[PDB]
Amino acid sequence: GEGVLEIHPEGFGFLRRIEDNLLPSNDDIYISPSQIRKFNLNTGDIISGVIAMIKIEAINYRPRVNFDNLTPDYPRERFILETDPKIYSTRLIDLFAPIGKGQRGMIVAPPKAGKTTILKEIANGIAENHPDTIRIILLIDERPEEVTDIRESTNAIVIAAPFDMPPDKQVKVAELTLEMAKRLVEFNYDVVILLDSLTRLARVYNIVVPPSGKLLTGGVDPAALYKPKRFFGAARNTREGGSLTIIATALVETGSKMDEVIFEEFKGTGNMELVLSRQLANKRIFPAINLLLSGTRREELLLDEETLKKVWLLRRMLSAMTEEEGLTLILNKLSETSSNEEFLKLI
Amino acid sequence: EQKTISISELESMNIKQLYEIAKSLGIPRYTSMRKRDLIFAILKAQTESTGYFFGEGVLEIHPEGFGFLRRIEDNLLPSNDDIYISPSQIRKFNLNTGDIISGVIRKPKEGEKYFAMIKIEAINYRPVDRVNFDNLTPDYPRERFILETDPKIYSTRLIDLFAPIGKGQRGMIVAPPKAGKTTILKEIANGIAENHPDTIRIILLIDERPEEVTDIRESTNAIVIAAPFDMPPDKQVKVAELTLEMAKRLVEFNYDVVILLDSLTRLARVYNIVVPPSGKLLTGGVDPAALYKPKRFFGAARNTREGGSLTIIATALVETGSKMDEVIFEEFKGTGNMELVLSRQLANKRIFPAINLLLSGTRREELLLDEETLKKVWLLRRMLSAMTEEEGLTLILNKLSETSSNEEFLKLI
Ligand code: IUM
Numbered sequence: 001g002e003g004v005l006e007i008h009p010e011g012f013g014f015l016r017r018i019e020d021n022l023l024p025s026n027d028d029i030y031i032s033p034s035q036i037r038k039f040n041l042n043t044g045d046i047i048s049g050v051i052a053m054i055k056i057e058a059i060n061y062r063p064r065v066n067f068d069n070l071t072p073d074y075p076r077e078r079f080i081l082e083t084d085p086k087i088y089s090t091r092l093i094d095l096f097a098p099i100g101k102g103q104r105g106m107i108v109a110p111p112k113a114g115k116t117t118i119l120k121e122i123a124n125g126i127a128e129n130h131p132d133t134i135r136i137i138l139l140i141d142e143r144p145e146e147v148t149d150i151r152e153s154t155n156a157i158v159i160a161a162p163f164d165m166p167p168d169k170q171v172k173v174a175e176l177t178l179e180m181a182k183r184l185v186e187f188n189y190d191v192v193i194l195l196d197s198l199t200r201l202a203r204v205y206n207i208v209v210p211p212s213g214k215l216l217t218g219g220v221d222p223a224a225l226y227k228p229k230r231f232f233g234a235a236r237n238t239r240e241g242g243s244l245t246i247i248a249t250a251l252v253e254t255g256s257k258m259d260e261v262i263f264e265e266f267k268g269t270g271n272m273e274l275v276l277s278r279q280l281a282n283k284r285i286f287p288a289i290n291l292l293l294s295g296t297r298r299e300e301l302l303l304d305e306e307t308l309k310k311v312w313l314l315r316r317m318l319s320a321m322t323e324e325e326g327l328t329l330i331l332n333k334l335s336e337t338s339s340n341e342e343f344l345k346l347i
Numbered sequence: 348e349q350k351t352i353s354i355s356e357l358e359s360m361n362i363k364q365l366y367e368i369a370k371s372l373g374i375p376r377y378t379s380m381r382k383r384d385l386i387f388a389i390l391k392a393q394t395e396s397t398g399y400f401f402g403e404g405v406l407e408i409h410p411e412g413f414g415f416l417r418r419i420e421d422n423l424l425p426s427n428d429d430i431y432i433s434p435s436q437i438r439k440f441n442l443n444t445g446d447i448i449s450g451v452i453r454k455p456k457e458g459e460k461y462f463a464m465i466k467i468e469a470i471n472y473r474p475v476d477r478v479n480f481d482n483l484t485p486d487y488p489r490e491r492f493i494l495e496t497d498p499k500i501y502s503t504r505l506i507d508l509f510a511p512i513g514k515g516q517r518g519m520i521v522a523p524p525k526a527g528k529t530t531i532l533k534e535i536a537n538g539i540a541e542n543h544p545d546t547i548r549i550i551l552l553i554d555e556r557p558e559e560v561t562d563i564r565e566s567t568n569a570i571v572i573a574a575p576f577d578m579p580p581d582k583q584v585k586v587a588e589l590t591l592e593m594a595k596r597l598v599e600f601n602y603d604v605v606i607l608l609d610s611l612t613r614l615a616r617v618y619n620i621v622v623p624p625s626g627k628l629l630t631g632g633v634d635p636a637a638l639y640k641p642k643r644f645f646g647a648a649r650n651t652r653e654g655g656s657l658t659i660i661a662t663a664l665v666e667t668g669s670k671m672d673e674v675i676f677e678e679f680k681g682t683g684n685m686e687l688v689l690s691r692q693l694a695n696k697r698i699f700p701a702i703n704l705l706l707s708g709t710r711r712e713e714l715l716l717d718e719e720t721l722k723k724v725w726l727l728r729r730m731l732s733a734m735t736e737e738e739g740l741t742l743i744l745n746k747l748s749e750t751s752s753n754e755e756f757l758k759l760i
Pocket residue numbers: 017019020024025026027028
C-alpha cells in the first residue's frame with residue numbers, strides 16, 4: 001500500500017488516499033511515532049510499503065532541504081505544451097504566454113469561456129512532452145460531474161472538493177495537497193498544480209475563517225486570504241532544487257461582488273497570465289484567448305531570440321486590428337500548419 | 348402515479364409471486380381470475396375484512412435497529428398507520444433508510460396492533476447486490492427528457508430547444524414573483540409523465556400554504572410530498588431528507604428519478620432556522636453553515652455511470668425584497684448545469700410562458716441535442732440578441748403556435 005502522510009497533533013500519523021481526495025477513511029494506513037520518527041519525515045510525504053505498515057520501501061518514490069528554505073529562482077526551463085496541431089490553445093500558449101517550471105500562472109476566466117478545456121489541454125501537453133513531471137489538478141467547489149470528466153481524460157492527479165463538501169474539509173484537502181507538492185519539490189521533482197480556482201479557494205477560506213478582519217467588503221473578511229495568497233505564492237523554481245508550477249484560475253464577470261473582489265486582491269500577482277475573452281466566447285470563437293493581454297515575465301528566459309521577435313511582430317499587428325480579427329487570422333494560419341515550427345517559418 | 352404503480356409493481360411480478368400474495372391474502376379463486384382482475388382484488392384487500400393486505404412505504408431505520416415504513420400518503424410523517432419492520436428483516440434483506448418496501452401486511456390484531464410486515468415482496472419495486480449512491484460515478488446526462496407534448500404547451504417546446512433537461516440534470520428555474528413558475532413545474536412533470544412513464548416523479552413542496560398544495564395535488568400527476576405550512580421546521584427538513592434518501596435508493600436500483608423542488612430557496616431558509624448557530628453570518632442573516640445542507644441536496648442530482656439518474660429541477664426565488672433570499676441565490680451560483688430563467692418584466696405584461704431565452708441554457712447540451720438542432724437553435728439565439736425580450740419571445744411564440752411540432756418548427760428555419 002501507499003498514501004499521503006498526515007502527522008496528528010500528538011505524534012502518530014495516517015496515510016491519506018488520493019482516491020479519497022485525501023480525506024480521512026478506513027482504509028487509511030497507520031504509522032509509528034516513532035516511524036516517523038527517524039525515518040524523520042513530515043506531512044505531505046508519500047509512503048509505500050507492505051501492509052498497518054510492516055515497513056517502508058519508499059518515501060516519495062525513493063528509498064533534503066526544507067521547502068521554505070530552498071533558494072527561489074526564476075523559471076529557466078520551458079514547458080512545451082504543443083502536441084497535436086489542432087489543439088490551438090497550447091500552440092498559442094507556447095508562443096504568447098509560455099509557461100516554465102516554477103511558473104506562477106493565472107488564467108483569467110469569465111463565465112463559459114472554455115476555462116476547463118484549456119486546463120485539461122495544459123495538463124495533457126505536460127503529460128506528453130514531460131512525462132517525469134508530476135501533474136496535480138485540484139478542484140475546489142467543483143461540480144461532481146466535472147470531476148469525473150476531468151479525471152478520465154487527463155493524467156492526472158485529480159483531487160476534488162466539490163461544492164457540496166463541508167467547507168472545513170474542502171480546506172484540508174487543499175492544504176494537504178499543497179504540502180504534498182512542497183514535499184515533492186524537496187525531493188527534486190518538477191510539480192504542477194492546476195488549480196480551479198483561486199476565487200473559490202478564497203471563498204471557502206472566507207466561510208471557514210473566524211471572523212475578526214479589518215471590516216468586510218465581500219462581505220469578505222480580509223483574513224481570507226491569506227492563505228490562498230500563500231497558496232499561489234508557493235509557486236517557484238529552486239536552486240537546490242525542483243519546481244512548483246501553479247496555474248490557477250481567477251474568475252471574472254460572474255456578477256458577484258464577492259468574487260470581484262477577490263479578483264481585485266489577486267489582480268496582477270502572477271508572473272504568467274492567460275486572459276480569456278467573454279466577447280470572443282460569446283462569439284463563439286475558441287480558444288477564446290485575448291493574446292494582447294496574455295503574457296509572461298521574463299520570456300527570453302523561455303523563448304529563443306528568433307521566436308521572440310516574430311511573436312513581437314504578431315503582437316504589433318494584432319494590436320492594430322480587432323480582437324476577432326485577432327485571431328481568426330492567427331487561428332487560420334494555425335489553422336494551415338502542422339506545427340508552430342512551420343507556422344513560424346511563414347513569418 | 349401513486350398508485351400508481353402499485354398496479355405497476357404487481358404487473359411486473361411473475362405469476363408465481365403474484366400467486367403467493369393472493370394466497371396469503373386469501374383471495375377466493377385467484378387462479379381463475381384474469382391477471383388484471385387479480386391485481387385489483389389484491390389491492391382491494393386493504394379496505395375489506397381480511398386483515399392481510401398488500402402495502403408499501405418507505406423505511407426509516409431507527410437507531411435501535413428496527414424500522415417503520417413511512418407513507419407517501421401522509422407526506423412521511425408519523426402514524427400508525429406506519430408499518431413495523433423488524434431487525435431480522437433489516438438485517439436479512441440488508442435494507443437501508445429510504446428503501447421502498449412492499450409486501451403482505453398484517454393489520455392491527457387485538458391481537459398485536461400495530462401493522463406488521465409479515466412478508467416482503469419487493470424492495471424499491473424490484474422483486475427481492477447494492478452499490479451505494481455515493482460510490483457511483485457522477486456524470487453528465489446522456490439521454491434527454493423529451494418534454495414536448497401538446498403543440499400549444501409552449502413552455503416545454505422552448506425548454507426542449509433552448510434549455511434541454513436530461514436524465515441526471517441539476518436544473519434551476521429562476522423565478523421572480525409571479526412568475527408562472529408553478530405551471531412550469533406542472534408542465535415539466537407532465538411531459539415527463541407522458542413521454543417517459545418509467546421515470547419516478549416526485550414533487551417536493553417545502554413549507555407552503557395548503558391551497559397552493561392542493562392544487563397542484565390535483566393537478567399533477569406525480570407523487571406529491573409536501574409537509575405543510577404549519578409543521579415544525581425540523582420536521583420539514585426530515586421530510587425532505589427522507590424524500591432524497593428514497594430517490595437515492597431508487598437510483599441505486601437503476602431507476603430514473605425526478606424531484607421537482609418548489610423551492611430551494613425555502614428549503615434553504617428552513618435549514619437556517621434549524622441548524623446549530625455557527626457564530627458567523629453573513630448577512631443574511633444567514634449562516635454558513637449551512638447552506639451546506641441544501642447544497643448537498645441539490646448536489647445529489649446526477650447521472651451516474653453504473654446506475655440510474657437523479658434529476659432535480661429546483662425553483663430559485665429571485666427579486667423578492669430579501670435579502671436572505673438574495674444571499675442564497677448568490678451562494679448557489681455555478682452549482683447547477685441547467686437554467687430556465689423567467690422574466691419579471693414579461694410576467695407583468697401577461698406573456699406566458701415568461702421565459703428569458705437568451706439567459707436560459709444547459710451545459711454540455713451537445714450530449715442532449717443533435718448537431719442540426721444545435722446550430723438552428725444557435726441562429727435563433729443570434730436573432731434573439733437583435734431584439735427585446737418581449738419581441739423575441741413574442742416572435743417565437745408566434746412561430747410555435749403556427750406549427751404542429753418542434754421538428755415541424757425547425758423544418759422552417
Ligand atoms: O481506496 U479508500 O477510504
